[PDB]
Every structure is written in C-alpha cells, then in structure tokens.
Amino acid sequence: GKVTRKIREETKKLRNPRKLSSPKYPNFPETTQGTVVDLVHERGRGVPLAHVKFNDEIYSLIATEGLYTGQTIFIGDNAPISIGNITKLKNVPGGMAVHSIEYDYEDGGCVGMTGGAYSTVVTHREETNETVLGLPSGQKKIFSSEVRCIVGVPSAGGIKEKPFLKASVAHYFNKAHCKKWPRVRCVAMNPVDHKFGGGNHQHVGRPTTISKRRPHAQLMGLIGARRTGRVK
RNA sequence: UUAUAGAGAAUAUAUUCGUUAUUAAUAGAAUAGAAUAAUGUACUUGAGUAGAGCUGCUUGGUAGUGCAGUUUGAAUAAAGGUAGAAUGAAAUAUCUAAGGUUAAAUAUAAUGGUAUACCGAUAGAAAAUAAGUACUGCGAAGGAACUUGUGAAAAUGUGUGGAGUUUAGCCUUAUUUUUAAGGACCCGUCUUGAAACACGGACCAAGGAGAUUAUAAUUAUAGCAAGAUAAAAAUAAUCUUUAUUAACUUGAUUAGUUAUAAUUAUAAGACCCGAAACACAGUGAACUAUACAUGUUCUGGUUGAAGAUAAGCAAGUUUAUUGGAAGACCAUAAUCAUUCUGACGUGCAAAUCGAUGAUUUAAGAUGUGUAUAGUGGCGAAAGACCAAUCGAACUGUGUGGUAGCUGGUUCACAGCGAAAUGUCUCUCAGGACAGCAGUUAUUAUUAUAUAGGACAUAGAUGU
RNA sequence: UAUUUAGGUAGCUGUGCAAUUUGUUUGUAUUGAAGUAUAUAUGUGAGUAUAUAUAGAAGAAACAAAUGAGCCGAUCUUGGAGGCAGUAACAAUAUAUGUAUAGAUAUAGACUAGGGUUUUCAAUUUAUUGAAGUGAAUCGGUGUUAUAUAAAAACAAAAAAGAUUAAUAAUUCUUUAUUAAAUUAUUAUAAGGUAACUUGAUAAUGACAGUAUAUUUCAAUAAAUUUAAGAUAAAUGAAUUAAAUUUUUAACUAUGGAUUGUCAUGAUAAGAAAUAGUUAAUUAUAUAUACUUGAUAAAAAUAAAAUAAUUUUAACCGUACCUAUACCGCAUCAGGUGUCUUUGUAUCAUAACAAAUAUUUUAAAUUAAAGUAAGUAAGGGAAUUCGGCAAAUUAGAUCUGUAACUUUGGGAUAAAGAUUGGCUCUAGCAUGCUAGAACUUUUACUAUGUAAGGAAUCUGACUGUUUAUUAAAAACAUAGCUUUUUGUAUUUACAAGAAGUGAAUUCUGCCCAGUGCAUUUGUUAAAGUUGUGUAAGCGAAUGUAAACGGCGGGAGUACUAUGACUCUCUUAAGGUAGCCAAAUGCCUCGUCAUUUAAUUGGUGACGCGCAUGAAUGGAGCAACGAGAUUCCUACUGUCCCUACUUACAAUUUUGUGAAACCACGAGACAAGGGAACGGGCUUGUUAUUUAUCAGCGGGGAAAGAAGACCCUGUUGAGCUUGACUUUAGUAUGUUUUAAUAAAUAUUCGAAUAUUUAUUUAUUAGAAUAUAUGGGGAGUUUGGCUGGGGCGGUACAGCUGUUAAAAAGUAACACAGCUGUCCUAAGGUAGAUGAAUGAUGGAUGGUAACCAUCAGUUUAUUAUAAGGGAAUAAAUCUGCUUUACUUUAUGCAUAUGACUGUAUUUAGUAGGGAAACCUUGGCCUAGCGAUCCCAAUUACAUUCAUUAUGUAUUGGGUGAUUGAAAAGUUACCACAGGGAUAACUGGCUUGUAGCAGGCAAGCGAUCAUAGCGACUCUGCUUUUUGAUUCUUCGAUGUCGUCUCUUCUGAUCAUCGUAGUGUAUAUGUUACGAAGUGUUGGAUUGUUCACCCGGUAAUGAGGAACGUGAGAUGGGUUUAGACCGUCGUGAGACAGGUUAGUUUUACCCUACUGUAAGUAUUUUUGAGUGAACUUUGAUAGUACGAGAGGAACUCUAAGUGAUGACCACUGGUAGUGCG
Ligand SMILES: [Mg+2]
Ligand SMILES: [Mg+2]
Ligand SMILES: [Mg+2]
Ligand SMILES: [Mg+2]
Ligand SMILES: [Mg+2]
Ligand SMILES: [Mg+2]
Ligand SMILES: [Mg+2]
Ligand SMILES: [Mg+2]
Ligand SMILES: [Mg+2]
Ligand SMILES: [Mg+2]
Ligand SMILES: [Mg+2]
Ligand SMILES: [Mg+2]
Ligand SMILES: [Mg+2]
Ligand SMILES: [Mg+2]
Ligand SMILES: [Mg+2]
Ligand SMILES: [Mg+2]
Ligand SMILES: [Mg+2]
Ligand SMILES: [Mg+2]
Ligand SMILES: [Mg+2]
Ligand SMILES: [Mg+2]
Ligand SMILES: [Mg+2]
Ligand SMILES: [Mg+2]
Ligand SMILES: [Mg+2]
Ligand SMILES: [Mg+2]
Ligand SMILES: [Mg+2]
Ligand SMILES: [Mg+2]
Ligand SMILES: [Mg+2]
Ligand SMILES: [Mg+2]
Ligand SMILES: [Mg+2]
Ligand SMILES: [Mg+2]
Ligand SMILES: [Mg+2]
Ligand SMILES: [Mg+2]
Ligand SMILES: [Mg+2]
Ligand SMILES: [Mg+2]
Ligand SMILES: [Mg+2]
Ligand SMILES: [Mg+2]
Ligand SMILES: [Mg+2]
Ligand SMILES: [Mg+2]
Ligand SMILES: [Mg+2]
Ligand SMILES: [Mg+2]
Ligand SMILES: [Mg+2]
Ligand SMILES: [Mg+2]
Ligand SMILES: [Mg+2]
Ligand SMILES: [Mg+2]
Ligand SMILES: [Mg+2]
Ligand SMILES: [Mg+2]
Ligand SMILES: [Mg+2]
Ligand SMILES: [Mg+2]
Ligand SMILES: [Mg+2]
Ligand SMILES: [Mg+2]
Ligand SMILES: [Mg+2]
Ligand SMILES: [Mg+2]
Ligand SMILES: [Mg+2]
Ligand SMILES: [Mg+2]
C-alpha cells in the first residue's frame, strides 16, 4: 500500500510548524502598579491580548472581562483581590473564577488560556498547604498553594452560538488555524489508501473499536473506547 | 661495392638511407685500492590481557577452526599452552603468547619499444582520424557516414528485325521452333492429412548459425614394455593394484602406460535470435498537484432586507418616500466543454474546426520567488497527476538473465534403413529403461544345426 | 565374369568438388597477370578447360598443415533502385505605356520571457560574399529583506524639451535644470504673536485589506473666432474636413451662551449657531463617510538645516533588431503564450460598418452525377422514430393583471391581454426627460441582437468540484447531527488528534448468545543463588449495539368462508413505527380503476414482501437542476412524396509532385471431388471498338495489430485475509546501577526484599528472554476429464462379466468389496448321519420336549464374489504355543525396487500306539523407500560415563515407487494453442415441421360426404441438441431501414371434379409460381396481442442475404446505485443510468461513353393475357315462404409504366418596386 493521511500530516508539521505567542507575565518581589496601554488581535487565536506596563516595561497578557484603556492594576504576592488583579492563590475565597494558573512558582501560566473558559476554586486545606481547583474540563485537580494567578473570567464570550451557515465561513477558519479542510470519508477511498476502503457497497466490515495495544500506524477509528452509543 | 654488410625501404626499367661493426659526450648505479675522520661500561621479556557463562557472524573443522558485543576476570619458569569425537582424570613427548623493524624469489594499468600461420574498408577499435566529431535529450546520458584505380546485378533510353489481338513461364518429341500434340496447381514449414478461404515471402548485391576448453569412455595409429612418462625446474608423483571388510580376523595374479585423430555425455554465454520480471547506483515539480511570500485582475442593466422620515386613524396601526444587504437574477470581453453521436479522420492538428449550450466579486483566474521525490510526493477521491510514459516514472550496471514454448540452420554421388507400442514419473505440449535401426570385429559339424512351414504320434481348452 | 542385387521421410556410414592462409618442389608474366561479359568442348553431378573483346600489375600446379571453410527463406541486417503514377494532395488580381490608375484580404503599436546579426548598405541572383553599425552622475542590474544560501513587477539620491545619422539616441549636439562628495569666501546662536502660528534656530519614518455612494480637478465634448484644404450637370441663410485661442469647504484659536446638518447614518454643557482670525485643500492608483468577517489585513537598510563659487569629480555590465512567415510544437503548422495603449456614428448596451497601418499579381465557365454549407415550399400536422434527434414558433420597451402550494422569505419577469412609424403643435419643470392632441401611408422593436408554455413521478437539499484524450452524474465536498482520546501541549479542553451519517420538519423499536473493546482478582520463558521463591499475556467475572452485526415454524376454534381466542418445537431476539410489483417482486406482460380508436408504457389503490425497513438511517418536496420518465397547447419537409436556386470542392488546363499494398496474376462462370464455401485441378457454357474516360461498393473468406474473450505453462504483477514462514515498533521480566545512616518484612548471628532521609554522583543508556504484531517482507495455492468449473474419483488392492474354447487386451462400461476380526475362529488326536420331512406321545395349540423311520449335501465353514471339502477342512471332548532360530533357491515378474507366497541344510518343541502333521487363519485381498527418532543382541579404544559404527523391529507419507502450502483481478501482463470452447460451414435426426398404410367407431340406418382410436412406414434442413474435421501472427455479433432474385408444401385471382351442392353461403380434391399480398397503439426485439381495412393483412431461402451501405436501442472493458452471497478483496444467465463506429486512387463484376457515309434484311438477348365496382339482365331462374344468382353490354376507379408543358400549383443572384 501507501502511506496514509495521518502519518503524512504529522511530517508536514515538521516542515513548517504553527506559530503562536505564548504570553507570560513577569515576577516581582513586592506589590507594584501598572497601566493598561492597548488591546490587539492575533492571527490564530480568538481571545484578544492586552499590553500592560510595569516599571516602564511593556509585557503582554490575556485580557479579562471588564477592562478599558488607561485602567490601573496591581501585581504582587499580596495584592487586593478584584477584577483583573493578579494575586496568590491562597487569598481568594471559595467560589470565584481564575484564568491563568502556573503549575509551579515563578512560571508564566499554564491553565485557562483560551477565551470564554474559566476555572473555579472549591476549597482550602490548611494541612499540607493545598487547595483543590475545578478545571474547565470537569475534573477536580489538587494544586499546591503559593502559585499566583489572575482573578476574573476571560473575554471573547461564547463564540459557538451562531453556526457556520455557509461553507465559505468554515474555509477561513481552518485556513487560519492551519488544519486540513475539507476531509474525505475513509469508506470512499480505494483499499490502497486506507484500511476501510474498497468494496462493492460502502460499508466497513471490520469492528471500528481499536485497542491501544497495537502499533502506531495501525491506529484508526474510535481508539480505545470504554463505551459506544447514545446513553438515552 | 665488394661482403664482421644478401634484414628492409625509395627512384629508373645503378646509385642513396640504413643494416653490420666501431667511438665520443652527459647523467645514474655497483665493486676494488690509497689517504683523511672514528672504538669504555649495559644481568630488562609485555594485564582489564589469556580464559569462563549467554548471544550473533565465519570455516571442510564435524559439540570453537577463527572473530566480536555484554557480564565476570587469573599465575608469573616451584609457572603456562598444544597434541583432527565430548567431559573429568593419568602418563609420554614438544613449545613459551599478549611491544617494534626487515632485502630476494611473486602480481598488473596509464606510458614507450620489439615480433606474428591474425583483419584488409558492411572486415579490423565506435573512429585509415577537420571522431568521442556532426546531431538528439530539461537532466543523468546517447552517438553515425565518408580511401585510391577498375565498374557486376536490380532499373531504364535509342536504332534495326519479327509475331498477333482466343491464353504468361516449364518438361518430352519434331529444321511447319516468335509454332503443334501429350504432361504439368507456388516454394519453405508445423501436421494423421496442404495448390488450399492455414502462416512467411514486391526486387538485386554483400553479411549470416554444432567452431574452442576442462574431465571421462570406446575405435584407428605410433614409441617402449613388467614396467610406462617433454611434472615444476636445471645445464618426485600417478597408473597397472587404494587386495577384501564398517572394523577386527585375513590376502598373488584378466599386459600396461604415454601421445595423435574422430564420436558421445556433463559443465562453461555453449547451434543463432526472442519475454512479462528482480536487485545495485543515480537524474527530474519548465507539463501538472498542494502549502507559503510578493504583484496584477474590463464594462452595462434587474430586484429590493435592516436603518430613517412624513402624512392620516386612535398601547399602536395603514399609505407614500429615502436607503442599498445577499456564497440573490441577467449580458460583452475572458473561461469551460452539454448536444449535433455535424466537419476532418495516410488530417490545419500524435485531440483541431463550426453552430448550439454553461458560466459573474469569488471555496475565482494568472506571472515570479521558496518548500515536497519513486515502496516516495500530492489528491473537494476518478487509481486521477508527477515533462506526449503511471495499479510503482526515467538513465546506466549484474546480463550474451531463464525458457519443457514459436522461427531458421548453407556442396554432389553411392551402400543401408525405422517408430507412433510396454513400465515408472506433481506425469499428460516433456523425460529414462525395454523394443525397432546402423557401423566395425572374431569364429565354422551351433548344417551331427535352424524354420511367422507340412506330415505322423501324445495332449490342453469350454466359444 | 550381379543369368541372383538397385524405391525411400526421420536417421547412420563411404568415395569426391569449391574458398582463405602456412612448409617444400616445379613453372608463368608489359609482344601484357588478377577481375568482368559472351560463346565452344568436356564431366552422371558438385565443376573444369579454351577462344574473342576490355583493363593495366602480379598470379598458378603437386606432396603435407590450420580453419572466422559453400545460402532463396529467419514479419533476417545495411545499401541501392521498381510498379501503383505524372495518380492523390496543394498554389494560381486588371489595364497599349506602369517608380502610375484601379481592385482585393487582414485592426494596429509598445515593455518582459525566448531568438542571436536576421539590422543598414553595396555587388551578383526571404539567396551568396564583403563592409559599417549599439556612446549614460539622474534607463535597468550591482543595495535591503520575506520570521543560518530567496525579487530585472515589493522598498530606495536626482531631467525635460528641440534637432541631427544609410543605421544609436531620456546616452551625441544646443537651451534651461537637479543630486552627492571634496576644497574656497561670509555668519545668526534668536526675535514676534493672548492663542492657533510666521522667520537660518534638528530627531522625524520606511509601512501596508475589500465593497458601495457623493464629489466632475484634469481631460474630453459643445459653442464662438482666425488662417488653410478638397470636391459638385445643376441648386442650397453660407454645407464638410484640418491647425490654434477663449469659454466656497475642513480642522484649530479667541469672544459667545443653546441650537443645528447630509444623497444617506447625525453632531453638541468633555460647549451649537453667529462674529474675528491661523493653517491646508492630498489631482481619479485622490478626498470624506458608510457597509461584510470564528479572515482585522508583511519585513529590513535608511535624516538633518542659511548665501555664493570651483572640478582631467561621479567606477563595472547590457543598450542593433523581431511579437508572430525572425518564439514552442521535427516546418513559412487554422494550436499555445505575462502586461498596457488605441479615432468616428452609434438614447441601456451588444452586434455591425468606416478611419489609420500593413500585404498582394494573371488557365477555363448559363451544361455532369454523388458531396460540404445556405435558402423556399400547395394540402395534412408527429401518422416518421428506441425517443419531436435536427429545424420551426416565442423574445426588446410601456400599461393592466397574476393561481394551487409554502421552510411565510418565495412561487413571479408566473400564466393572460392591449400599445409601438413619420410630421406639425400644446402642457409641466428638473431644461432634456415625460404625458396628451391634430394630419398622413401597399401600417411601424425586429438589418443586427433577443425566454416555446403548462400538468405530474423517481432521485440529489442549495452555491461548488471531478476521470488532460470515448463516462459531468443520482459520484465527491459542504454546513447540520453523533461517538471517542488527551490536565507535564513553543500553542494549553469554547483547545488539539481519530471516525460515521449528510439542510430544515417528524421519528430513531427488540437482541450482548458469536466477533471485537474496556475494567478488576487454572496455564506460562530466561537469567541469577549453597539451594528455594516471585512477570506480562491467555483463561474466568461485569459492562457496551448512532461497535461489526442479527431480527422463526406448525395445529385446532365462532350457511360457507376467516380466526379476535387457545395449544405447541426452540432462542440471544423472533422485524415493531412506517413503505411498495418502487433504481428493491423469479412466477410476471400480478388484480382493480383511469389515461388512448387500440397500451408489456404512465398515474392511483391491494399485499403470506423469491430477497423492504429505521444515523450500514426510515418517512417527506417548498426553493434549486445542460439529471432520468409520461401526457396536453402552439409549431414545423421528421413524414405522405419530393421539387427548384447559389457558393466551395469534383469534371477540363499549367506548376510542385507522395504513401499504404505487392508468392504469380497472363479474361470471366455452372457442377464435381478436396483440409467437408477454388482465380488456377476435372467435364461443360462463354467475352473481345486502335489498345480509352468518368462513376460504383457484389467479391478478392480486402488493408491495419505475433486475439484483449477461452485453455495450457510446475511464467509474472497489483490487492485482501482466521493461508505458510518471519520482522520494524511496543509491553513485561533478569543482570548491569552514587555513597551513607535508619526503619520494616521474608528466610534460616547471617542471607534476601520493601520503604524513608542527606549530598559527595545523576551524559541516560546497554546486553539477553517471553508476549503482541497484514503496519511491512518473501512464496505457494495437485492430476484425470467427450472445452474448463461444480459433481465423482475410473489416482492404491480383490472377485465375476465385457473377452472372441493356448497366453495377452480398452471405455466418467456392468454388479460389488477393502485399512478389519481371532489365545482361539491357530496346531494335533479321537468320536459323530448335519439342514429338513413323515408318523406318534398328559396337560400341548402353526410353533416347547421325547422316541421311530427317511434324509447326495439343501446346512455350516468371521467377511465381497468365485473355487474346494460327506469316515468330512463341519459340531463336540482332551492336550498344547511351530503366531520358532539358523544355511541356499524359485513363482507372480519383469530391464527393474518393496510385498505376498511355495521349497531347502542343521537345530529345538507339541499332538499320537505308530506311520505321519505343524514356519498363523481351507485358497485368491486387508500391501509402504532415502534421512531422522526409540528399543533389542554382539563387540571395538591408556581409565570411568557418554557419543559413533554393523544386524532386526516400531514411528509414515490414502495424490498409496512417497514436496512442507489459502483466495481474487471488470485495472491486468508475457510465451504459445484451432492438440481446446463462444460464431459460420460439414456428417446425424433424439427434438421440430410436413405427409402416408390398415380400419374399432362417430355421422338419424351408412366405415371411407366430412373425421378417425390402439399400432406401423417415410421425407426436409426451416427450431433445439450430440461430435470437435477447417480458422486463435483476428473471416466485425442481435434487431431495424433500403433493394434484387429464387422454391412449392397456394392466401386471393384462373380452369375442372366430389358433396350430408334446391339458390345463397360453405367444405374437400387435381392442374397452375403470370401478377398482387398494402395502415397503426405497447415492447431493444425476433416472437406476442389488440384497432382499422381489403379480392386477399400465405409459408420460406440467398455466410440464421446485406456495418470500407446506414443507425446504435439491448447485449458486452474502465464511473456509479439498490437487493442477495462472502469476515475481506470481490461475485450475480437479479434489476437500473452515462459511454470515440477508421481506410478505395489497384484487379474483377455492373451502369453509361468510345468503329467512313446513305437505305434496309436476317439472327440473338430482354419484355410480352394486372384487379375492384355502379346501372341493365332481375326481384328473373330456384324456392311452401323467407330469401335470392350467372353469360353478355355500357359507365368509372386503384396499382404499375412510357412521355409532355395549352391550363393550375412550387421555384427563381433574370427583371422591376
Ligand atoms: Mg471509487
Ligand atoms: Mg491495506
Ligand atoms: Mg450509504
Ligand atoms: Mg613471553
Ligand atoms: Mg574485400
Ligand atoms: Mg568501419
Ligand atoms: Mg490437363
Ligand atoms: Mg489440425
Ligand atoms: Mg478452402
Ligand atoms: Mg487468416
Ligand atoms: Mg506478406
Ligand atoms: Mg554470400
Ligand atoms: Mg534477452
Ligand atoms: Mg533505488
Ligand atoms: Mg451571484
Ligand atoms: Mg462525429
Ligand atoms: Mg533528487
Ligand atoms: Mg475502480
Ligand atoms: Mg503524462
Ligand atoms: Mg532397401
Ligand atoms: Mg508444437
Ligand atoms: Mg533407448
Ligand atoms: Mg480337440
Ligand atoms: Mg537407394
Ligand atoms: Mg560462419
Ligand atoms: Mg540473399
Ligand atoms: Mg532452405
Ligand atoms: Mg530496406
Ligand atoms: Mg485548389
Ligand atoms: Mg545578411
Ligand atoms: Mg530605430
Ligand atoms: Mg530625445
Ligand atoms: Mg538603443
Ligand atoms: Mg532599441
Ligand atoms: Mg507575446
Ligand atoms: Mg501560426
Ligand atoms: Mg456547374
Ligand atoms: Mg408545407
Ligand atoms: Mg401552407
Ligand atoms: Mg408513433
Ligand atoms: Mg411505425
Ligand atoms: Mg433540440
Ligand atoms: Mg401615434
Ligand atoms: Mg447537487
Ligand atoms: Mg474524458
Ligand atoms: Mg456540470
Ligand atoms: Mg464529456
Ligand atoms: Mg454524498
Ligand atoms: Mg437530517
Ligand atoms: Mg459480547
Ligand atoms: Mg442495551
Ligand atoms: Mg409489519
Ligand atoms: Mg419511496
Ligand atoms: Mg394497461
């Protein structure tokens, strides 16, 4: 046969990988004050970024919900908690919304980068100095304290309301996000290109649930499912 | 010009260069003599080695013959290694590993010489050289013709002579030979069977296919013979005859050996020409496909969503304007290819021409630059496209790849003359053994003998 | 001394001729060698010798030697030259005197890619030779970069006119300018305005989407004026052409205190209008606003300034010419190729015409046929056809008017009507647009351009894309819906990877037994330790079907009929909601209705559905479609049935001048035999213009291509998988791993294991074992066979028949059997009337047991069949293990293994008194090599244990004298085969068709007017079979259209004869092939069945007549859909839709044309009696009545055929409007 589509797409990512910003905030020993300068828009991502200014140095950050040009925010380990400020994790009471959490201390940020997605805090445990967070995916993860984070819900709202009612709307989405579009179903192909292909009618003939035990080039279909079907 | 010179060239129908035989100059090498320089003390022995366990390659080496990866890793001459089945033990022989140098006898191109039972311009190298040239391919690469005198055949022109219009050419017999009577389908080839409506062949010249080598055997000839011989080299072995047997136990005997020639068998490109394929090493995105950067992309009409203004009727609701949204509607230039199954169909053209059709601000069209290569790329998916080639591109090598299968195989006369049947076979388009044939040889009561016969006698059988 | 022998394919042996070179001997030649061409002699023949002509330098013979040693063929290799043939195919403007007067076709001009002297001139005839020609501080390159080699179109210091040369000119020359660098002369270091700001007085940027509307800057039109030009027989308030001169707004500041603008949306207490003022007005590629987006629209090098002057200061490379007859397609090729500019009329444009500019020289003609284009048609209007394929009708603009349905947006420009010129005026205001009125005519968008309409069904939601060169679609994509993996992402869950269905509306039923997937607690390798112990995986349990998939059958029960209800086999569950003879139903052209004169078609209903059915999605149509199918209206040469005109090729002339093909073709036919369809062979019948010209497609099984279909080959390739053998990747053990201290557990002070802490290590790996592993890699996938496949094994053994009186012998011929059974069913000694029948005997019967008599093989002998045995080879009783060990040989049987079975020398045993018998079954069947493994007996080496050898058995190949092995190809390839199928032909006639002989009976009695049972004998090649003789280096399949000819087994028409013939109307038989046999609906049809009509719609042949005559509907390559089968690639004589039809110019045949005049005769060939009907005969003959003819005589008509233009109709580059 020939090399299929999945392996040929990953080696096309090594010839020209996709490029993004990775915005991080600095670290400062005591509480300082900074000003918001302007709001911009990037090519790949939907959430707008913000340029703040600490000690006559301009950095880049993800914009929170209510933010206007010229406003003042504070950064430090013991800043007061309000909209757009960045404090330590232990100060916030249970029930609020944070949107950039570093895994360890003195890191930029790891969790909650996209627009419209936020996390919640559920508790504090004074023994061993740990707090449990509620991830946007729905899983409870235990975080160590003394990491610092930003208070508020991120901007850009709910983008998934109105559909791509035309085909032309989805053309410019996948082109900016560097994905392959359109896609051909694997049953329509000839049996050289794909395992499911060929035949006299369009059907599969093999079970579509494939274990994870098998090697890398044999993985296709619903890989390693614990369940299949509508629940009710 | 007799000759230490009769090797060979050149001129014309008796002369020269040389051969033969002698010297000189320069460079290099070796041997010997004479002279100049020079001579003290020296007790070293080879470690992450040799060897074991697991694992892979190599050799004739069989249970390592040799080498390497990983783990482990000794003794120092009162010591260590080896001795053609395995391990353990013992005697007798014989050697001392893990550091270094080394002439001669030996193998073969570019470059220059000397010879020959080799070829003589379709031969000999691709090239008697303005030849690795003219010319072709995007590229790796491919690659010819032509000497000087004589003037054959195929195919034509002019002149003279002759027949008839109902019959090409050939054989026999005839002085009615440019006619008469008899005979006579076109050759080669597979085939039970060919003039066949079975295949190859329009015509002339030149070229063109069982030769060479190794190992065996039979026949003819030559030298010596209980022995036979040009092995390498310089001025021994082998065969008669390994005497049998697995071995022990045992054992005389078919004139040979060396060469020359013809035939047969096996292996070498192997009588000549012919596949679809496989591996090694390299070249292409100028056509066409996709992504990224930078530029360019003619003109006229149709319809009427949000938003806004007024005038009526009385929380609102009818009428008239303004406005110009949409993968909305229609045409020219540009683009594509539904139908006539129109034209053409040794074409204008290795895909064109005419009428009729479809198409319009976009998921469009197009120039240039960078990225993607053949068990690989690109793909709104037809196995489509990747330089007129794609269900695995193109160029060179292994390569004169293998063929139980089609085709061809070159002079005369004389003697002799077949099979299409039995058995075994992954055997049925093929092989081997038996049968039928040919050639040569020795010998006579195996004529006191034989017979695809008859007669006399003794019998077998179940149509 | 052949009085005896002599043919011969495949094949074997002997004697001889030809060519090139080598050693020795003998000889020739310039008064002429070798070669070549004609004769003569000689040899049975391969060949040799001589003579004459030509030419000019070396060659011959004998005895021996070495081979690249003798051509008709190979679709053989290279060169030269024929026929067809001067044939096909192409090129062909006018002038009596000209560097001109006319005609004709074509839009034209600049930068780049490519070309490289083609440029210009001279001389000689799109050629040859020779000279000359390209001038740069400001026109390109050289510079910067596109997130470790990138731009002649992105960014960047600066110029224009006017003339010169045979050819260069933003480059030479004249005139007026600009930039940068080096040297000179001179100098402000700040003023002014309340403010916005003005003047020598620095630190700025390169730099960035698309669409719509409003400005009318320039420019261009239009007008006026001034100089000039060209024409008219005439006439014209003065025409036509050329050159120039002219035709307030936006920000900001100061007062002010509440209104005000645009074509549209508005602006203002974060200060409107109105005043006073300061900056600018970006030149159409501009300015200001508005609108669309999960798209927000590149990088880097790069900066200073006042006034005047100077310069042998500004380097290197290219600057000719062509834009298609100077590029690429082998070419002076109807193809292809980036950007820009271009005048006049043109009331939306388009189309068309004219300017401008560039090219160009001489055959004939009122006449062929058949072609390629363009026109017109009386009457009928789809009757032609698979199908309205091709053509025709409609169309612009203004005014009325507009339905069912609906996803409320659409449908809609629906459909259906009416109007349109020219000239003279009137009326509006926005001043070039729109309404109305009068007059007039061979009536008005129509030169060019410009929608036929309506009603239904199947399928796809829509815009979009695709097999460059036979398929544009119902295929692909798409939004929408759903499932799944990942919290250690250069990117961070509204994100990033993997799959299925296919807009909206309404729904998405049951099953976890099978195969997969996930989660969790019996079997299983190596390495290490004195020894021992510990892996994943497989197996088991629980979930999961918008995962692969699946979703039965039989019996009774309420006048007939049916079964709400009941009983019953099993299973994982037994197709629910829906839908249908549908693109899915074989029987099948299902049943009913409707559409038509007539329907296998279309639409609506019915359902025990061969084989429908729910995201492998079911149901459904509003909008959209060069998709597939049926019916109405209009329209027409598609047809009845064809006719006329023009142009270009063709026919006639000159010039340039080919190809396919060719065994021999010298005239053609009927029958015969033959390799079963002859141009040539055998018997018959026949042509001929002085050697032609133009047509045509019957034949040469015509030409192209070593058949793609089918079969064979111990020949291949693409693809799939539960085929055989393995491997990359990955999971899990063991051993290697920095030191230290401590804790805990397991084994016996010690050995193991687990876990924590510190820093003194921390490049991050290495060596082995087990499992998973079509993601990959090699290779295989028997034979026989009345073609192959499916079925059987006729592939190993045994018996009887075929089988023909010695031995031997075939068929997918006949009837059968075999891979077993037995410690006794083996060995031996002895005794013995078996099976059955008759007559009797308490319970006792057809049949229980006991006696008597008879009893030739009927009984038994393990088994298939055949053979053998009656003091028995059978049944009983006793005793035993010959179901042995060693030397030699034979028979099936052979040229030959393995096997079965008879016989021998010498031992050791059993039965018997002894003679004797015994090496498994009474005889003919139950039969297996080389290599390797296991066992038994002997011995062999310095020593123990082991290994290796000789001998005998067992383990086994059933394809049985013996490889280790699954499929598919419609994407396919190679070598071959008429040794072998699909089509024609040939022998045969079971089947098909057409007739005969005899006479039981029917017919009111009567066999034969007319029929005829049970049986029997034939012909024809017209159905379908059976066989495989000719063709696989090719003979073009079914049906239809057009056209000719032939047969009798006669449908009418003609002549006779029977009758169960009164007339009329029938029916049967004999002679007879002259002439007729005609129109439509449905289906690809042949066949079939209806409507209508007539004198009568007869049966058939000619390669199942006829494709270089046509068409292409089905069948039959590559796209695609449904149903059934297969895990899968795939398959279906089950159903659909779209799919390139080549070549005549040879020979022969056929139609015409081609022999000095003028009058005729004879012979030969063709052709030579079509059919219906009115009136009279006549209401007559004949008949109870009803009814109801004929001979003959007049009047017409249809079908065919030969001519003609007085009348009518069609046509018309002849003629007029
Ligand atoms: Mg496909
Ligand atoms: Mg595959
Ligand atoms: Mg489907
Ligand atoms: Mg040593
Ligand atoms: Mg020669
Ligand atoms: Mg040569
Ligand atoms: Mg004859
Ligand atoms: Mg034959
Ligand atoms: Mg024949
Ligand atoms: Mg043939
Ligand atoms: Mg030929
Ligand atoms: Mg020759
Ligand atoms: Mg070859
Ligand atoms: Mg390679
Ligand atoms: Mg549109
Ligand atoms: Mg055509
Ligand atoms: Mg390369
Ligand atoms: Mg396909
Ligand atoms: Mg190609
Ligand atoms: Mg003979
Ligand atoms: Mg053969
Ligand atoms: Mg033989
Ligand atoms: Mg007798
Ligand atoms: Mg003879
Ligand atoms: Mg030869
Ligand atoms: Mg020849
Ligand atoms: Mg020959
Ligand atoms: Mg030739
Ligand atoms: Mg012409
Ligand atoms: Mg020139
Ligand atoms: Mg010029
Ligand atoms: Mg100039
Ligand atoms: Mg120039
Ligand atoms: Mg120029
Ligand atoms: Mg061009
Ligand atoms: Mg051209
Ligand atoms: Mg004419
Ligand atoms: Mg008409
Ligand atoms: Mg008419
Ligand atoms: Mg019809
Ligand atoms: Mg008809
Ligand atoms: Mg049409
Ligand atoms: Mg009027
Ligand atoms: Mg569509
Ligand atoms: Mg095509
Ligand atoms: Mg289309
Ligand atoms: Mg097409
Ligand atoms: Mg689809
Ligand atoms: Mg749906
Ligand atoms: Mg299950
Ligand atoms: Mg369930
Ligand atoms: Mg049902
Ligand atoms: Mg339906
Ligand atoms: Mg009907």
Ligand SMILES: [Mg+2]
């Ligand atoms: Mg003409």
Ligand SMILES: [Mg+2]
């Ligand atoms: Mg004949």
Ligand SMILES: [Mg+2]
């Ligand atoms: Mg015959």
Ligand SMILES: [Mg+2]
């Ligand atoms: Mg002719």
Ligand SMILES: [Mg+2]
């Ligand atoms: Mg062939």
Ligand SMILES: [Mg+2]
């Ligand atoms: Mg074979």
Ligand SMILES: [Mg+2]
């Ligand atoms: Mg293969």
Ligand SMILES: [Mg+2]
């Ligand atoms: Mg494979």
Ligand SMILES: [Mg+2]
């Ligand atoms: Mg076979």
Ligand SMILES: [Mg+2]
């Ligand atoms: Mg017995």
Ligand SMILES: [Mg+2]
């Ligand atoms: Mg055999």
Ligand SMILES: [Mg+2]
């Ligand atoms: Mg197919």
Ligand SMILES: [Mg+2]
């Ligand atoms: Mg072939």
Ligand SMILES: [Mg+2]
């Ligand atoms: Mg045959």
Ligand SMILES: [Mg+2]
């Ligand atoms: Mg035929």
Ligand SMILES: [Mg+2]
């Ligand atoms: Mg019959």
